[PDB]
């Protein structure tokens, strides 16, 4: 069912995360971590302190899909185990240095064709698939987007609820 999912999403904040490649999303799904540009890292750290759940909704550029969504379980931290991200053309790993811990809520994909009816007020009411990396998604749009994903029966949200 969807009741624990709705509980986790209650009063949450939502951010669109754009990866240039599948490799980084696969690494994030395997290791429970994410890193972003410093401009976005500052926004996510502020959001983590301000809301009961901060949700990252992932999309690999040019894939036409979202690849899942996850909840921040920490602010960003440096000096942990290194993560072998595939780095965009220009600038090095010092940029992607802050590491957030995340708990996956859904590792299933959702094609953009299924979210065409959702627009994001914080991006000019453009379709929610449209947005830069780090674009915040308004509460109602983000909740409905997450509820469109196929259920991920491998996930138990009991442990996430306890972290709140
Ligand atoms: C592990 N993190 C990543 O792959 C990643 C890459 C980005 C980028 C946003 C805008 C770019 C030119 S690059 N934001 N996050």
Swiss-Prot record:
The record describes its post-translational modification as: Tyrosine phosphorylated.
Result of changing residue 19 to A: Does not affect ability to influence alternative splice site selection
How changing residue 132 to A affects the protein? Reduced binding affinity for N6-methyladenosine (m6A)-containing RNAs by 100-fold
Q: Where is the YTH domain?
A: 12-149
Mutating residue 133 to K: what's the consequence?
Answer: Does not affect ability to influence alternative splice site selection
Q: What is the effect of changing residue 68 to I?
A: Abolishes RNA-binding and ability to influence alternative splice site selection
Residues binding RNA, per UniProt: 18-20, 34-35, 85, 133
* Documented effect of changing residue 34 to A: Abolishes binding to N6-methyladenosine (m6A)-containing RNAs. Abolishes binding to m6A-containing mRNAs
What the protein does comes down to: Regulator of alternative splicing that specifically recognizes and binds N6-methyladenosine (m6A)-containing RNAs. M6A is a modification present at internal sites of mRNAs and some non-coding RNAs and plays a role in the efficiency of mRNA splicing, processing and stability. Acts as a key regulator of exon-inclusion or exon-skipping during alternative splicing via interaction with mRNA splicing factors SRSF3 and SRSF10.
The Swiss-Prot or TrEMBL note on domains reads: The YTH domain mediates RNA-binding.
Quaternary state and interactors: Interacts with SRSF1. Interacts with SRSF2. Interacts with SRSF3. Interacts with SRSF7. Interacts with SRSF10. Interacts with CPSF6. Interacts with KHDRBS1/SAM68. Interacts with TRA2B. Interacts with KHDRBS3. Interacts with EMD. Interacts with RBMX. Interacts with ZCCHC8.
Instruction: Quote the protein name from its UniProt record.
Output: YTH domain-containing protein 1
Q: What is the lineage of its organism?
A: Eukaryota, Metazoa, Chordata, Craniata, Vertebrata
Query: What stretch of the whole protein does this chain cover?
Result: 345 to 507 of 727
């Amino acid at each position: 069912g969807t009741s624990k999912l709705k509980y986790v999403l209650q009063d949450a904040r939502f951010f669109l995360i754009k990866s240039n490649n599948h490799e980084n999303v696969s690494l994030a799904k395997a290791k429970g971590v994410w890193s972003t540009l410093p401009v976005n890292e500052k926004k996510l750290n502020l959001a983590f302190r301000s809301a009961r759940s901060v949700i990252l909704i992932f999309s690999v550029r040019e894939s036409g899909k979202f690849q899942g969504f996850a909840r921040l379980s920490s602010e960003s931290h440096h000096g942990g185990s290194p993560i072998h991200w595939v780095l965009p053309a220009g600038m090095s790993a010092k940029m992607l240095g802050g590491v957030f811990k995340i708990d996956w809520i859904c590792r299933r994909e959702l094609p953009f064709t299924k979210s065409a009816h959702l627009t994001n007020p914080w991006n000019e009411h453009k379709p929610v698939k449209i947005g830069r990396d780090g674009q915040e998604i308004e509460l109602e749009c983000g909740t409905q987007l997450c509820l469109l994903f196929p259920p991920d029966e491998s996930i138990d949200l009991y442990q996430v609820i306890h972290k709140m």
